[PDB]
Design a protein around this ligand. Structure first.
Ligand code: BCL
Ligand code: BCL
Ligand code: BCL
Ligand code: BCL
Ligand SMILES: CC[C@H]1c2cc3[nH]c4c(c3C)C(=O)[C@H](C(=O)OC)c4c3nc(cc4[nH]c(cc(n2)[C@@H]1C)c(C(C)=O)c4C)[C@@H](C)[C@@H]3CCC(=O)OC/C=C(\C)CCC[C@H](C)CCC[C@H](C)CCCC(C)C
Ligand SMILES: CC(C)=CCC/C(C)=C/CC/C(C)=C/CC/C(C)=C/CC/C(C)=C/CC/C(C)=C/CC/C(C)=C/CC/C(C)=C/CC1=C(C)C(=O)c2ccccc2C1=O
Ligand SMILES: COC(C)(C)C/C=C/C(C)=C/C=C/C(C)=C/C=C/C(C)=C/C=C\C=C(C)\C=C\C=C(C)\C=C\C=C(C)\C=C\CC(C)(C)OC
Ligand code: HEM
Ligand code: HEM
Ligand code: HEM
Ligand code: HEM
Ligand SMILES: [Ca+2]
Ligand SMILES: [Ca+2]
Ligand SMILES: [Fe+3]
Lengths: 258, 317, 40, 280, 60, 319, 60, 60
């Protein structure tokens, strides 16, 4: 790696042989690292790097072609995606600064609650049935011999107050497991789905603790179109709503601690 | 299998061997070091003698080495020896009830050699033993047969032909490793080249074998646990063979590696002819000497205990 | 299991004759070696 | 400059300390309290590391002082001072610089914390990163402390900190026999065995043979069920991995810690407890 | 023939697929674990005694 | 069961999934799937069925010979005394042929069994590689796994095929032993001047480390985003989602840049597969091309310089 | 092939394709093995003895 | 309990069992930490002097 060389040998004739392949592979990768996102949006802080450049060190790659399975469309990577929308205003005219959520941040659909418009279709299994469905349809699925049953437990909330009770849980045909919980909100008496990721258990009191949002927030949760299957579009917009709680369910959360 | 969590406690000893932050550091257990010293103590030297009167060869008829000395000194060197070798069986050990000069009991014969043996060490091999020296105690420590003596280890059991594989057994010889575990014979007893570290940048110069180095590693292990230290002591691991860097001790030990040979090749091996069965190994070879024999897990036998100095008969005349 | 008494006894029979097929072919095996190289 | 889907995520809040003040984005990075902190350590240390290359073992005019990235080295002070600050020249730099390492590593984690706090994501990453930092807190704090000398640390030299690994290693003879060390190693290997396996499968299902559709989790399971029988599971691997990774470091931390403070003899020998068992 | 009387009922609880397969394995490995260990033992036949060393004769 | 997506709180079970339909020529899966509540509390509970065709059976039988041979000799040295066998297990091991045989076929005693059990373990892997290749195309899958497994195999053979044979001595080969093989790598290094200065050996570590690093990030990230369905990478690779939609922003804001849900797995691959790549090489060079990587480094001004507070003489030149 | 009569019934319970592959493979190893275990001991025919040393008339 | 008179108010802020058990550990880690730190060298009552000498005299 020295600037000047006075020594030559086979050992070193192969080392550089690697770095070249390396410097090349790292680029190969970078190219791929841009099949989702780029180009960038603004110029808040002029692309930083040993060598600036227009759009990174490596020019964007060629659109790959993804043939979804039967009864499916087609995806291209990368792809020219139409600009999204921001339901928030700039906390400051200075670039980089954050964007304050308008109205109730719990549903402003921004940041934590913000979710992209995923395909308004539904994921399926190998054969063609909706991958993720409620046990009210999964005639084969049963609770593991021994493990306590969730169906019937009362879903508590952040503040502690009860928000509703589980009426059913959504299992996954493709990958045997519990992914959602058909929760029955008390307030709106509606039926919203609850994601495992946020679903906590207290087998002692037959509950499904949730620190995401308050019991009251469970009310206006992104409803589902068909109660016999969850759409990818909504599915992602579902558990995203809970995320908001992770940062909006309480002014204290977003507020500093020190 | 399982993971260690603390068989020894903090804070362990520390000894900075190399430049600041070179890795070369010695870490020793505090308590253990204590007990070692305590239980590993010498024996107060006997009262000085008149050193006058007649000479040994003068009155005593059958004396071949301690002649130079006088009577009181010689009578003294006779006492010391008995307390250091067979303080259990008295003088009758290397003699005959009455025949203070007979050479019927083998214990005497060897004692003669052993005498020259010691002397030599203190007189001609001073680069190793320094101005300190060794006495019959250093090896015998009060026992007719030195506890830490060795022999050509037979190895593992006989599968009826494919038994030669003598590297699969944790022998206390090599600090409980899985090496040949018998480097003492091929090295400490023989003279097999210990060096294998190529001295040239590229290949084609050193034909050393990979197994060979395993062997050296063997010996080194054993040596390491003999003096009871860590390779850092003698070297800087990134320069196992660069002496220009490695440590003064490294050389000091060098000589010993031969001082030991000497002790086996010109003293301990010849006496086998007279030594009995219980003193001979399975391969017919006699109990020889090793770094472990004297050092016995201490870089400096008896922690620099200077015994020989007070004994003039224990030096070449 | 997976069968009744009928199919069961039939198997056992043929299955035996096949086992004595071994013991005999192996015992005769041992013996042939026993004569050649005596162990013990 | 933001990604096609960045703007809708740059929300305000979720800060631990003095967030509103530094609550903003500089390019593709985030600052906040901890943001500025780390930086205050970066240059304050990165430059000192350079000052070391500048100065050298003895002096800037010496023949030792070099700039070869390989030969560059910043060794700690002697074991004499123990828990005392040695002259900036004779070990001082290392000591100070190291204090900047913790200020960079820890803060970097803390920074990640609230960063996740904004995305409402899980605090897995940081908690995971903790171990790495923890392992560091052992090779410079924990161990040295129970050894009574900040000089027990490792030199900050691209190749220099390898010798420190060779000596301390052989300091216990054949360092390959360390229980915790072995165990840990296994993990590092398992982990790599996991990546080579995970990453591979994904690319093998989303980019199948020519004229083939994107496989589903239906295949993934069968695939490893036909080569070895069982399939851990989708997120399962993402769990397993995370485990191995951390476990690899954890057991390692133990590996070096036990070496010295909890054991001075030679590791190869430690295994004797198994031998001296009244069963053989 | 004695025991063969009621031993037929055995297949009524133990599937034949099981025995047949395991049996082959055991008898296979087991067997190989004999010429093997015994081979390594004194009564070796390949290179122990006779054929008396011809290698030595023919080779050179 | 602490839920940070660590342990599946509540499990459910469905009829044993006998894998997906395979092509013509591929034998039907075998083995009645099993269920484990505990295991399943970690990930998947169902077990099997498993495939086993020609290559498969030919493999499971092949390598199973080597293992036996090894474990055999091991229990042989202990004089078939299991007691001392389970005692010295770690130490026990099948040693390679003595240098007094070069590459020639040694007697079962002096190194024979090793070689045999070796070829049976060499092909056992080579064969197993094909076994995997047959499980990929049979499912229309690619060969990313074979490519990797290949790379690993590469370094595997470097320890016997390409290097030892290139040296002309079966002595330079790793032995069949838990502990003794640790000594092999222990000796090898000593024999070749300290692998710390061996270039490739370093590059390879960067991977043994990088590897651990990435998965620590990925494995984690996916979990942290497991809420927004971040585990279902497949449908994420096809049509980007919210999981991967924040999952990157994190890294981006933290380290500046980032990659895609798919992309990363590609890095991981090359960060792991390249591990052994720099492995077989670093060892393929040692013994043959270079003999003392220490002097080799300083030869190119690599080896750092340290003051001389300690130094030893040299009785050789002196005497 | 006498006993072949009663032995025919085996095909009704075990999948023929299995016993074939299991064996076509089982012999594969056994063969590669024997020449090996033998060539490594009794007579290393290839280069241990006869014929005319490839070393003697060879190397020289 | 001098200052304890107005210090009762501190409880509306600090949780009850939170700092309660949060200290139970603190104490522990401290105790052994101190039995330990002191043991290492200052006073090693375990093995250092009498009224011991059980092993040195007893063993012998
Ligand atoms: C003679 C030498 C000995 C030996 C002596 C030692 C010694 C001595 C030690 C180890 C240690 C380790 N050895 Mg060992 N080891 C030997 C042979 C081996 C072999 C082998 C195949 O032969 C292997 C696989 C290992 C494996 C290992 C690891 C398990 C362990 C390192 C653990 C770790 O994860 O730290 C994880 C990481 C860290 C501590 C660093 C922290 C990372 C920080 C927070 C991030 C840095 C960011 C940076 C500033 C930014 C860079 C970006 C730039 C700006 C561009 N050893 C030989 C036998 N080994 C060490 C150990 O046990 O550690 C616990 C140790 O101390
Ligand atoms: C030890 C000293 C002697 C010696 C003594 C013996 C003795 C003693 C015995 C052997 C036996 C054998 N020896 Mg010998 N042998 C020596 C040297 C050799 C050498 C050599 C190269 O030097 C070789 C290659 C062999 C080779 C062999 C094997 C042919 C045979 C092992 C059979 C077996 O275990 O099947 C394993 C078993 C099975 C697969 C299953 C059981 C068999 C049943 C009956 C058939 C299966 C039924 C099935 C359900 C129907 C479907 C049919 C097909 C499977 C599709 N020997 C030396 C000279 N050898 C054994 C033997 O042949 O017994 C007959 C035996 O007892
Ligand atoms: C774990 C046990 C030992 C240890 C044992 C080893 C061994 C053994 C080896 C290394 C190797 C490396 N070690 Mg180390 N190392 C230790 C602790 C550290 C610490 C630390 C903060 O504690 C750091 C920053 C490093 C850094 C490094 C890298 C220079 C090098 C590449 C490793 C790698 O690829 O990881 C995977 C990760 C990445 C590729 C990404 C980020 C790492 C980057 C490339 C390294 C930047 C370091 C930089 C020079 C520090 C100054 C930054 C200034 C801003 C300029 N080590 C501890 C003390 N280390 C290898 C080497 O080749 O050394 C020459 C090697 O073989
Ligand atoms: C004192 C000894 C030296 C040393 C000597 C060596 C030697 C010698 C070697 C390494 C090698 C490596 N060392 Mg080192 N190493 C040292 C210290 C370290 C330290 C450290 C922190 O101190 C670290 C982190 C490392 C790290 C590493 C890795 C980068 C590399 C291991 C690659 C690998 O994947 O192996 C694990 C993987 C494989 C062997 C391949 C797998 C092949 C197939 C898949 C396995 C077959 C499966 C089979 C069916 C299983 C059945 C078994 C039967 C029962 C028999 N070394 C010290 C300084 N190191 C290797 C290297 O690449 O050197 C350049 C190597 O050869
Ligand atoms: C069990 C934990 C595993 C792990 C996980 C892990 N690492 C992580 C993370 C996680 C989860 C991150 O989130 C973080 C990251 O990459 O975030 C984007 C990271 C990271 N892991 C890194 C490195 C790293 N991890 C390692 C290991 C591991 N990382 C484990 C396998 C290793 C090694 C030795 O194997 C290295 C080298 C970094 C790339 C990055 C953290 C970067 C960071 O926070 O840097 C902060 C500080 C600076 C940029 C400035 C430093 C200047 C100081 C003033 C001086 C300090 C001197 C220094 C100590 C000298 C080093 C000299 C050496 C060359 C000898
Ligand atoms: C001698 C000479 C002439 C010198 C010239 C010197 C010159 C010109 C200098 C000027 C240039 C300068 C100053 C450059 C400075 C550049 C700097 C400081 C950069 C700092 C950033 C930094 C420290 C980055 C560290 C990155 C490292 C080491 C990462 C290690 C892990 C790794 C392989 C990451 C690459 C792949 C990525 C991005 C993984 C992260 C990642 C993971 C882990 C997911 O799981 C995941 C899941 C879903 C979507 C995305 C992701 C994702 O991106
Ligand atoms: C008795 O045993 C029973 C029945 C109870 C079963 C129990 C078995 C047990 C317990 C087995 C345990 C085995 C263990 C612990 C094995 C451990 C092995 C280890 C640690 C191995 C480590 C490393 C091994 C390496 C690196 C092996 C490399 C081998 C190579 C490279 C082989 C190459 C072979 C070649 C190239 C062959 C070529 C063919 C010829 C020679 C003809 O070419 C000229
Ligand atoms: C206290 C008890 C002992 C007494 C009184 C004693 C006395 C003597 C005397 C007087 C001589 C010289 C006499 C002569 O040869 O003419 C002598 C010689 C000798 N003694 Fe002792 N001895 C004692 C114990 C021992 C022991 C324990 C050993 C054995 C290790 C020993 C070994 C020898 C030897 C080897 C010689 C001959 C020395 C030579 O060759 O120069 N003696 N002893
Ligand atoms: C000058 C003082 C010494 C005297 C008088 C002496 C005497 C003896 C005697 C009488 C024996 C035979 C013991 C027996 O088996 O009955 C013996 C054996 C032996 N001595 Fe010494 N010895 C002395 C110094 C040493 C030293 C310094 C070493 C150490 C290297 C040593 C190593 C041995 C060994 C290895 C044996 C063989 C073991 C045995 O005989 O049981 N001796 N010595
Ligand atoms: C367990 C750690 C140790 C290891 C791995 C080790 C390794 C080695 C190696 C590989 C050599 C051969 C160098 C060459 O090719 O020239 C060697 C030589 C040597 N070592 Fe060590 N050593 C260790 C500990 C020690 C200790 C503690 C001492 C000091 C008492 C020591 C003293 C020597 C001497 C004197 C030589 C030269 C021998 C000759 O004349 O051939 N070594 N060591
Ligand atoms: C081949 C194995 C041996 C090795 C490697 C070895 C090595 C060493 C070393 C390195 C020292 C210096 C220790 C220091 O500086 O603190 C030393 C000192 C010493 N050795 Fe050995 N030794 C061996 C065998 C022996 C034997 C068999 C005896 C017994 C007669 C012996 C007696 C001594 C004595 C008396 C000293 C102290 C000298 C002094 O204070 O400087 N050594 N040995
Ligand atoms: Ca007999
Ligand atoms: Ca070995
Ligand atoms: Fe993944």
């Amino acid at each position: 790696s020295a600037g000047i060389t006075h020594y030559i040998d086979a050992a070193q004739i192969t080392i550089w042989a690697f770095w070249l392949f390396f410097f090349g592979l790292i680029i190969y990768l970078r190219r791929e690292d841009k099949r989702e996102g780029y180009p960038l949006d603004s110029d808040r802080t002029e692309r930083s790097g040993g060598r600036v450049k227009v759009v990174g060190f490596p020019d964007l790659p060629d659109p790959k072609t993804f043939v979804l399975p039967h009864n499916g469309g087609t995806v291209v990577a990368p792809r020219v995606e139409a600009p999204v929308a921001v339901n928030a205003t700039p906390f400051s005219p200075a670039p980089g600064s954050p964007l304050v959520p308008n109205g109730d941040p719990m549903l402003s659909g921004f940041g934590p609650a913000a979710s992209p418009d995923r395909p308004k279709h539904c994921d399926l299994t190998f054969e063609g049935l909706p991958k993720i469905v409620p046990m009210r349809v999964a005639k084969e699925f049963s609770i593991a011999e021994g493990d306590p049953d969730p169906r019937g437990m009362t879903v508590v909330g952040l503040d502690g107050e009860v928000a509703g009770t589980v009426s059913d849980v959504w299992v996954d045909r493709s990958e045997p497991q519990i992914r959602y919980l058909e929760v029955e909100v008390a307030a709106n008496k509606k039926k919203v789905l609850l994601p495992i990721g946020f679903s906590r258990f207290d087998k002692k009191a037959r509950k499904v603790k949730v620190d995401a949002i308050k019991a009251a927030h469970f009310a206006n949760v992104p409803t589902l179109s068909n109660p016999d299957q969850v759409t990818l579009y909504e599915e992602d917009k579902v558990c995203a709503y809970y995320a908001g709680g992770k940062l909006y369910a309480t002014a204290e959360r977003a507020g500093p601690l020190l | 299998s399982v993971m260690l969590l603390g068989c020894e406690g903090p804070p362990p000893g520390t000894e900075q061997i190399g430049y600041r932050g070179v890795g070369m550091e010695n870490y020793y257990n505090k308590r253990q070091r204590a007990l070692s010293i305590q239980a590993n103590q010498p024996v107060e030297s006997l009262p000085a003698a008149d050193s006058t009167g007649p000479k040994a060869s003068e009155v005593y008829q059958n004396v071949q080495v301690l002649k130079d000395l006088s009577v009181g000194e010689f009578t003294r060197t006779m006492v010391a020896v008995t307390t250091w070798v067979s303080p259990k069986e008295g003088c009758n050990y290397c003699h005959v009830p009455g025949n203070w000069a007979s050479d019927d009991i083998y214990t005497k014969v060897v004692s003669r050699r052993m005498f020259e043996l010691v002397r030599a060490a203190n007189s001609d091999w001073k680069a190793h033993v320094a101005e300190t020296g060794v006495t019959c105690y250093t090896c015998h420590r009060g026992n007719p047969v030195p506890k830490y003596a060795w022999v050509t280890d037979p190895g593992p059991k006989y599968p009826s032909g494919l038994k030669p594989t003598g590297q699969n057994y944790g022998s206390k010889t090599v600090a409980y490793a899985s090496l040949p575990f018998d480097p003492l014979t091929p090295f400490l007893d023989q003279a097999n080249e210990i060096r294998i570290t190529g001295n040239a940048a590229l290949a084609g110069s050193n034909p050393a074998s990979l197994k060979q180095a395993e062997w050296t590693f063997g010996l080194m292990m054993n040596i390491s646990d003999s003096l009871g230290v860590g390779c850092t002591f003698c070297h800087n691991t990134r320069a196992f063979n660069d002496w220009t860097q490695s440590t003064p001790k490294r050389t000091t030990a060098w000589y010993a590696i031969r001082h030991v040979r000497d002790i086996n090749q010109n003293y301990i091996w010849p006496l086998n002819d007279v030594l009995p069965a219980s003193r001979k190994g399975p391969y017919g070879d006699p109990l020889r000497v090793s770094c472990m024999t004297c050092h016995q897990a201490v870089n400096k036998p008896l922690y620099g205990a200077q015994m020989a100095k007070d004994y003039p008969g224990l030096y070449k005349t | 299991t997976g069968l009744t008494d009928d199919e069961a006894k039939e198997f056992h029979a043929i299955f035996m004759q096949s086992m004595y097929a071994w013991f005999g072919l192996v015992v005769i095996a041992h013996l042939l070696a026993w004569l050649y190289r005596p162990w013990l | 400059a933001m990604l096609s889907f960045e703007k809708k995520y740059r929300v305000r809040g979720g800060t631990l300390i003095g967030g509103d003040l530094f609550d903003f984005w500089v390019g593709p990075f985030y600052v906040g309290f901890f943001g500025v902190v780390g930086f205050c350590f970066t240059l304050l240390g990165v430059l000192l590391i350079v000052w070391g290359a500048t100065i050298g073992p003895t002096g800037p005019t010496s023949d030792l002082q070099t700039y070869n990235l390989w030969r560059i080295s910043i060794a700690p002070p002697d074991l004499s001072y123990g828990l005392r600050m040695a002259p900036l020249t004779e070990g001082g730099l290392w000591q100070i610089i190291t204090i900047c390492a913790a200020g960079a590593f820890i803060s970097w984690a803390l920074r990640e914390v609230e960063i996740c706090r904004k995305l409402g994501i899980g605090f897995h990453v940081p908690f995971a990163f903790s171990f790495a930092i923890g392992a560091y807190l052992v090779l410079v704090f924990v161990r040295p402390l129970l050894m009574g000398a900040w000089g027990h640390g490792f030199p900050y030299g691209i190749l220099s900190h390898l010798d420190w690994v060779s000596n301390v290693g052989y300091q216990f003879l054949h360092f390959h026999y360390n229980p915790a060390h072995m165990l840990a190693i296994s993990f590092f290997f398992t982990n790599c065995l996991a990546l080579s396996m995970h990453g591979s499968l994904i690319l093998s299902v989303t980019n199948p043979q020519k004229g083939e559709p994107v496989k589903t989790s239906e295949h993934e399971n069968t695939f490893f069920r036909d080569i070895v029988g069982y399939s851990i599971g989708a997120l399962a691997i993402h769990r397993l991995g995370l485990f191995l990774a951390l476990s690899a470091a954890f057991w390692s931390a133990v590996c070096i810690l036990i070496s010295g403070p909890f054991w001075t003899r030679g590791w190869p020998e430690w295994w004797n407890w198994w031998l001296e068992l009244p069963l053989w | 023939f004695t025991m063969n009387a009621n031993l037929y009922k055995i297949w009524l609880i133990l599937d034949p697929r099981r025995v047949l397969v395991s049996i082959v394995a055991f008898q296979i490995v087991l067997g190989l674990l004999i010429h093997m260990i015994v081979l390594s033992t004194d009564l070796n036949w390949l290179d122990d005694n006779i054929p008396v060393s011809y290698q030595a004769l023919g080779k050179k | 069961p602490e839920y940070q997506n660590i342990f599946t709180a509540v499990q459910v079970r469905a009829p044993a999934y006998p894998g997906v339909p395979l092509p013509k020529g591929n034998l039907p899966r075998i083995g009645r799937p099993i269920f484990s509540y505990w295991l399943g509390k970690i990930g998947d509970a169902q077990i099997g069925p498993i495939y086993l065709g020609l290559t498969g059976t030919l493999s499971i039988f092949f390598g199973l010979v080597a293992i036996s041979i090894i474990g055999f000799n091991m229990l042989a040295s202990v004089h078939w005394d299991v007691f001392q066998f389970l005692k010295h297990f770690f130490w026990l091991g099948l040693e390679p042929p003595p240098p007094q045989y070069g590459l020639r076929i040694p007697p079962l005693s002096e190194g024979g069994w090793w070689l045999m059990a070796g070829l049976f373990l060499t092909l056992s892997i080579l064969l197993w590689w094909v076994r995997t290749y047959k499980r990929a195309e049979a499912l229309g899958m690619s060969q990313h796994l074979s490519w990797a497994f290949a790379a690993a195999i590469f370094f595997y053979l470097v320890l016997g095929f390409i290097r030892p044979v290139m040296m002309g001595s079966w002595a330079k080969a790793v032995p069949f032993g838990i502990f003794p093989h640790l000594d092999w790598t222990a000796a090898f290094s000593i024999r070749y001047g300290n692998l710390y200065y061996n270039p490739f050996h370093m590059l390879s570590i960067a991977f043994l480390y990088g590897s651990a690093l990435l998965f620590a990030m990925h494995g984690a990230t996916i979990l942290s985003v497991s809420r927004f369905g971040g585990d279902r990478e497949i449908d994420q690779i096809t049509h980007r989602g919210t999981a991967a939609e924040r999952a990157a922003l994190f890294w981006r804001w933290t380290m500046g840049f980032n990659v895609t849900m798919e992309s990363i797995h590609r890095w991981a691959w090359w960060c792991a597969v390249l591990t052994v790549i720099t492995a077989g090489i670093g060892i393929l060079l040692s013994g043959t091309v270079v003999d003392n990587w220490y002097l080799w480094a300083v030869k190119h001004g690599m080896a750092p310089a340290y003051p001389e507070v300690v130094t030893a003489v040299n009785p050789y030149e002196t005497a």
